[PDB]
Amino acid sequence: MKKILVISDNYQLVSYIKNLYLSNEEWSKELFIDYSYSSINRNPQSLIELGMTEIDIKNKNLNELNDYHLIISAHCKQIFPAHIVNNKLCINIHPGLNPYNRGWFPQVFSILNKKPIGATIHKMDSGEIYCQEEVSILSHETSIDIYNKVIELEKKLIKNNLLKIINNELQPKLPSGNYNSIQDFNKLCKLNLEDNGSLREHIDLLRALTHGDFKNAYFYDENNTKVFVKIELSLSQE
Amino acid sequence: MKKILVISDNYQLVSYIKNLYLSNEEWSKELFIDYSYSSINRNPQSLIELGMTEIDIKNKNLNELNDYHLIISAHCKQIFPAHIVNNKLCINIHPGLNPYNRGWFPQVFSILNKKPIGATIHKMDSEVDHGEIYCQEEVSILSHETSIDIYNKVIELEKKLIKNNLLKIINNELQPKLPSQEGNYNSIQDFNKLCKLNLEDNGSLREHIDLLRALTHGDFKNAYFYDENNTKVFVKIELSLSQE
Numbered sequence: 001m002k003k004i005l006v007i008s009d010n011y012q013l014v015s016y017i018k019n020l021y022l023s024n025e026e027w028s029k030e031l032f033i034d035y036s037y038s039s040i041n042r043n044p045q046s047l048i049e050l051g052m053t054e055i056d057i058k059n060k061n062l063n064e065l066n067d068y069h070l071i072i073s074a075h076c077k078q079i080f081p082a083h084i085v086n087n088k089l090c091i092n093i094h095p096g097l098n099p100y101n102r103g104w105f106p107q108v109f110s111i112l113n114k115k116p117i118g119a120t121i122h123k124m125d126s127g128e129i130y131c132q133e134e135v136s137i138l139s140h141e142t143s144i145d146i147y148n149k150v151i152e153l154e155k156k157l158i159k160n161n162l163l164k165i166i167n168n169e170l171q172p173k174l175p176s177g178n179y180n181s182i183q184d185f186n187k188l189c190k191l192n193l194e195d196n197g198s199l200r201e202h203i204d205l206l207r208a209l210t211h212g213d214f215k216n217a218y219f220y221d222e223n224n225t226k227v228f229v230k231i232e233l234s235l236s237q238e
Numbered sequence: 239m240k241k242i243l244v245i246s247d248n249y250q251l252v253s254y255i256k257n258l259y260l261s262n263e264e265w266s267k268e269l270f271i272d273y274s275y276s277s278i279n280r281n282p283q284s285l286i287e288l289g290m291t292e293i294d295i296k297n298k299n300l301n302e303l304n305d306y307h308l309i310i311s312a313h314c315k316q317i318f319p320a321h322i323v324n325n326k327l328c329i330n331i332h333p334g335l336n337p338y339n340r341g342w343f344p345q346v347f348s349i350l351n352k353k354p355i356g357a358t359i360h361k362m363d364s365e366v367d368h369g370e371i372y373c374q375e376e377v378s379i380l381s382h383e384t385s386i387d388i389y390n391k392v393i394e395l396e397k398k399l400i401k402n403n404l405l406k407i408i409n410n411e412l413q414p415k416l417p418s419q420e421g422n423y424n425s426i427q428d429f430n431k432l433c434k435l436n437l438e439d440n441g442s443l444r445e446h447i448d449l450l451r452a453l454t455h456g457d458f459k460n461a462y463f464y465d466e467n468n469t470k471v472f473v474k475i476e477l478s479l480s481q482e
């Protein structure tokens with residue numbers, strides 16, 4: 001039997017792991033799993049509901065982590081310190097296709113730059129890839145659409161690979177890239193009405209920056225009023 | 239007393255006129271008002287509910303219209319034939335600032351070409367949205383507004399113009415004035431060209447946003463492109479002064 005820690009701020013992926021544990025006897029016989037959300041999460045209520053304790057991974061002492069065979073990061077909002085990843089086997093469930101558009105919001109960047117998008121489970125380092133797979137971007141899709149395919153794919157990757165990774169039955173491999181910063185994200189959000197480009201470029205920018213009800217793209221008008229912008233695309237008219 | 243014919247395919251305008259009649263003794267004491275929708279209206283059900291009969295003004299005979307002092311057109315989907323307008327006093331309630339962007343969807347065109355937008359009540363002559371103007375008023379286009387936002391402001395203004403002027407017009411107390419210029423007319427084909435997006439069009443983001451907001455009008459999408467595989471993708475935009 002192994003003890004495992006999952007550090008996640010993502011309701012869907014945590015629920016999914018929890019549901020696999022409950023529906024798969026192979027998990028329940030082999031594992032004790034503790035689940036924690038990040039101390040920086042501003043809205044953890046639904047994770048609390050789900051069955052999770054707060055952890056602060058930046059200040060957690062290695063001394064309190066000795067029982068864990070490994071730690072899984074599934075969209076943990078805090079970066080793990082170097083000392084955690086060098087002293088504990090840490091595996092990341094990552095919503096991008098390493099090594100393309102590493103960093104922030106891989107699907108936003110892939111919409112714009114056409115590099116592959118997908119999901120990757122890999123070892124953390126200051127990492128080697130156990131499994132990954134690509135998803136497609138279709139012409140009518142926004143950031144939220146692609147992210148939703150990505151989450152779907154992560155669940156598939158978990159379901160088919162995670163127990164094996166935990167049991168050492170799947171060995172990783174160093175990536176054959178590029179990285180995008182939060183500041184790169186924020187530069188994109190600040191639209192320039194005077195930008196000359198193709199309608200295609202400008203629709204892609206709006207679609208990259210459309211993600212649910214929270215708008216990101218904005219301009220300032222003539223009067224310095226802030227106006228947020230999003231786009232809707234559909235294969236139906238109505 | 240006078241007998242009046244209102245031909246309209248717009249619920250909001252017909253319901254407004256009905257409500258003023260019901261609420262203003264000056265109307266009910268002077269006027270008998272018949273209301274009709276266009277035979278071409280594919281979905282008149284709400285209008286039927288409202289209390290209205292079908293009319294085909296394109297084939298209506300002039301002899302059946304002798305009782306009417308005047309005919310009011312309020313977003314009638316059929317165009318009045320020349321013989322009707324030249325032989326009956328016909329008054330149009332138009333959702334544009336004549337003579338600018340006469341014809342179809344004035345606010346779409348105004349978002350694109352920046353000509354004034356507003357509402358106009360004018361005499362109908364044999365040209366579209368071209369006769370002498372009784373009254374009209376401008377509305378503004380703000381940076382976050384789509385076709386439907388400006389349309390709703392236009393409708394609100396048509397209501398105020400009717401409320402403040404329509405009895406006077408009927409009673410020959412307000413004389414109209416020539417439009418300031420011939421102006422410019424947009425067809426349905428002009429609108430449908432706009433709808434077909436050219437993804438290679440080279441422009442400022444402002445031009446592109448203006449085109450998308452001109453074409454955004456409620457849940458029915460107008461603007462489209464075809465993608466790599468010839469799939470048709472409709473496009474609308476949302477602009478707002480709040481994030482969420």
Ligand SMILES: [Cl-]
Nearest residue numbers: 418419420421
């Ligand atoms: Cl002239």
